[PDB]
Structure 1
C-alpha cells in the first residue's frame, strides 16, 4: 500500500491515542493535584526522533507503564501497539526496514531518565507519554527516517 494510506491511519490513531492522555491530563492544574511527579519536571523531552526510535519509545515506555496499576494508562499501553503496527508497514513503503523493539532493550538505559522518583501517579507517565505519541505524528511530515 502507498505511504499515504499508512499515514492516513497513523494520523487518526496518534490523534485518538493522545485523546485518552488528554482526558486524564484535564486535572494537571498548576500545583493542585499534580503531586508526586518526582521533582515537578519533564525529563521525557519531545526531540526529533526517527521511525526506529519511535517504535523503541513505545517499547521502553511499556516497561514503566507496567508499574502503573491504573486502567487509564494500562488501556493506553495496548493502543500504542496500533501506532507501531502502521509504523512497521510505513518504513516498508520507504524502502527502509526497522527492527521490531522487544520492550526490555533499554529498561535501565531509560529508567535513569525518570530515576523512579515516586513514578506511580498517572499524571507523571501521561505527561511523558502525551507528547511522546503526538511526537510520532508531526514526525511523519518532518523526517520519518529508519
Structure 2
C-alpha cells in the first residue's frame, strides 16, 4: 500500500468534505469562531495536533451527524468514516495504535435542531481546515 497515495487521498477527501459543507447554504453565513453556549461538546476551541486527537475529534462529529436527519449530513458522515480509516492507516505507518463525552446532545437536538446542525457543520469545517493545514507538518501519534 503506497503511503504517498494515502496522504494525498486524505488531503483530497478533506477538501471534498469542506466543499460539501460550502454547498450547504445555511452554514457558510455562520462564523465558526463566534461561540454558541450549550454546544461545548462539539470540537472547536481545541488545536487538534495528534493522530489520536484527530481520531477522537472526528468520532465525536461522526456521532453528532448520525443523529441529524438530513441526507447531506449522511454523505458527510460516510466521508468521515473513510477519513478515520485513512488516519488509522497513516498511524499504522509509523507503528502506533489509536483507541475507540456527555449525551446532552439528545436534548439539544430536540430543542434546537437548527443550532445543532449549523454549528456542527461549521465547527467540522474549521476542524478539517486545521487538520489539512497540519498534515504538511509531520503529525505525532
Structure 1 and Structure 2 fold alike (TM over 0.5): yes
Aligned residue pairs, count:
131
More helix by share: 2
Runs (5+) with no aligned partner, structure 2: none
Partner of residue 113, structure 2: 120
Equivalences for residues 45-64 of structure 1 within 5 A:
45=45, 47-64=47-64
Separation in structure 2 between the aligned mates of residue 73 and residue 135 of structure 1, nearest angstrom: 20
Note the C-alpha offset of 1:93.
1.4
Instruction: Work out the CA distance in 2 between the residues paired with 1:55 and 1:38.
Output: 24
Indicate how the Cα distance of structure 1 residues 48 and 60 shifts in structure 2: closer, same or farther if over 3 A, else same. Answer: closer
Please report the TM-score for the alignment, with normalisation by the length of structure 2: 0.74
TM-score by length of 1: 0.72
Q: For structure 1, which runs of at least 5 residues remain unmatched after alignment? A: 32-36
Question: Which aligned segments of 4 or more residues in structure 1 are displaced greater than 4 angstroms?
Answer: none
RMSD of aligned Cα (Å): 3.0
State the Cα deviation string for residues 90-140 of structure 1 (Å, max 9, x = none).
1111122222x3xxxx3x18x58xx93855123221111112222222222
Deviation of 1:63 after TM superposition, in Å, equals 2.3
